[PDB]
Amino acid sequence: EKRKAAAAILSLGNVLNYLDRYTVAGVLLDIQQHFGVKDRGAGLLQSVFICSFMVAAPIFGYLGDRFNRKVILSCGIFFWSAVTFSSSFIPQQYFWLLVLSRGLVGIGEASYSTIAPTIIGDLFTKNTRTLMLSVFYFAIPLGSGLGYITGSSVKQAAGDWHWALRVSPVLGMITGTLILILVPATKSWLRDMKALIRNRSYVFSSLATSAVSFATGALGMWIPLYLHRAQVVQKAKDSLIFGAITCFTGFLGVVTGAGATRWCRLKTQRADPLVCAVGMLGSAIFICLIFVAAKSSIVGAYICIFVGETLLFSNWAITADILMYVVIPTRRATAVALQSFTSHLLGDAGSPYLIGFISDLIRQSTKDSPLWEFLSLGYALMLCPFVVVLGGMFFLATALFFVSDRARAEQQVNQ
Numbered sequence: 283e284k285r286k287a288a289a290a291i292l293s294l295g296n297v298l299n300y301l302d303r304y305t306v307a308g309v310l311l312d313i314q315q316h317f318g319v320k321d322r323g324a325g326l327l328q329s330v331f332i333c334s335f336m337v338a339a340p341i342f343g344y345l346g347d348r349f350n351r352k353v354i355l356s357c358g359i360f361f362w363s364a365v366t367f368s369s370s371f372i373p374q375q376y377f378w379l380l381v382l383s384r385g386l387v388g389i390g391e392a393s394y395s396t397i398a399p400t401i402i403g404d405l406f407t408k409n410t411r412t413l414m415l416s417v418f419y420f421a422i423p424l425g426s427g428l429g430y431i432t433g434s435s436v437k438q439a440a441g442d443w444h445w446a447l448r449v450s451p452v453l454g455m456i457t458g459t460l461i462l463i464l465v466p467a468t469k470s471w472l473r474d475m476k477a478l479i480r481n482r483s484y485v486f487s488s489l490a491t492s493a494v495s496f497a498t499g500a501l502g503m504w505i506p507l508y509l510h511r512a513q514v515v516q517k518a519k520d521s522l523i524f525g526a527i528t529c530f531t532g533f534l535g536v537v538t539g540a541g542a543t544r545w546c547r548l549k550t551q552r553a554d555p556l557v558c559a560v561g562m563l564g565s566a567i568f569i570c571l572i573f574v575a576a577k578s579s580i581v582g583a584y585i586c587i588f589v590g591e592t593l594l595f596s597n598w599a600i601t602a603d604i605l606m607y608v609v610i611p612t613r614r615a616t617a618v619a620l621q622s623f624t625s626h627l628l629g630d631a632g633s634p635y636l637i638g639f640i641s642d643l644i645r646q647s648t649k650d651s652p653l654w655e656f657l658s659l660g661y662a663l664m665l666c667p668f669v670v671v672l673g674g675m676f677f678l679a680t681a682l683f684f685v686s687d688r689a690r691a692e693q694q695v696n697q
């Protein structure tokens with residue numbers, strides 16, 4: 283009877299996790315205008331966070347099997363809450379300290395988002411554990427959008443950008459306490475790596491997920507600032523609209539992907555990768571349309587964001603099924619760990635920084651002006667459709683081997 287509460291508390295903790303992760307982004311314009319840093323600064327913020335997360339994920343996965351998971355989970359929560367709160371008081375002179383703060387929050391968030399799912403899965407039974415793991419990943423995008431919403435609302439209400447970073451730890455501490463109280467104290471991989479690299483459909487799926495992570499990171503970091511620059515040159519609320527859009531489109535896209543796969547599985551055996559490919563094509567088209575619409579009317583830009591976003595997440599969420607079907611269950615843990623690590627390394631661990639770099643390089647080659655700021659950010663973000671198209675081609679390559687590797691996987695698991 284206690285398990286039904288601990289799952290809810292871990293889900294709320296995850297909501298708060300993503301809330302902080304993206305409230306550092308919903309307030310980006312004020313951070314720049316205060317610290318005086320260029321686009322590469324914000325790129326550095328988000329890329330340092332992700333590069334810390336993707337390196338601290340396998341470590342805290344190792345320390346999860348050896349020592350007890352509850353105390354390390356709560357230590358992680360308290361750590362990233364306290365570090366966010368303590369970085370909310372950084373002077374206008376020090377920016378590297380705010381970046382180091384984002385790095386330490388990355389470590390503290392890796393601990394949680396890596397160790398919590400194991401406890402969720404162990405607290406329940408098969409059907410109910412699947413239900414609860416579904417609630418957890420439903421709580422993911424909710425917090426992902428609440429990030430922008432809370433950041434913008436709090437910044438506007440208090441008139442300062444520090445408050446967006448102040449208001450979350452007061453819930454972080456409460457959740458850490460509740461997890462120390464409620465959650466019960468529940469009790470050679472190189473060969474696997476060589477075999478998985480020998481695999482083909484899994485490798486193409488890994489590169490496709492890496493492309494999706496690239497596009498997701500770059501967009502989710504720079505879209506509010508891009509839209510604000512558009513509104514400025516088109517002579518606050520924009521991040522709020524985008525937060526509502528994403529908080530809806532997460533669920534909407536996972537449901538659309540589920541419907542498409544359940545509809546197409548009967549027509550072709552290589553359905554799921556073709557579903558991901560057509561979703562990638564549509565998302566690339568609508569993302570390319572975002573920027574050409576932003577120059578005229580922002581409502582069309584929002585429509586394009588919503589459509590491209592629901593076509594973007596639909597394909598990535600069902601990649602975990604390809605991974606489970608192709609990998610024999612004896613190496614699934616290492617397969618998913620390697621896939622997450624690679625999708626970060628190639629994806630959103632260098633994507634916000636890369637877009638900041640391109641924006642800076644295009645701006646410095648022309649006269650600085652809000653018009654040119656907006657055009658430079660647009661041209662730099664236009665690199666996202668290219669990576670989305672590459673992910674689509676890699677999903678096609680995945681389809682060209684899905685049946686064969688699934689057959690071999692069934693053969694190996696049957697014996």
Ligand SMILES: CCCCCCCCCCc1ccc(-c2noc(CCCN)n2)cc1
Binds near residue numbers: 499
């Ligand atoms: C534009 C920047 C926005 C930033 C969004 C960042 C996170 C997006 C979340 C998308 C998502 C949703 C669900 C799942 C999932 N995993 O397992 C299951 C259970 C399977 C039951 N059929 N659902 C995974 C990923």
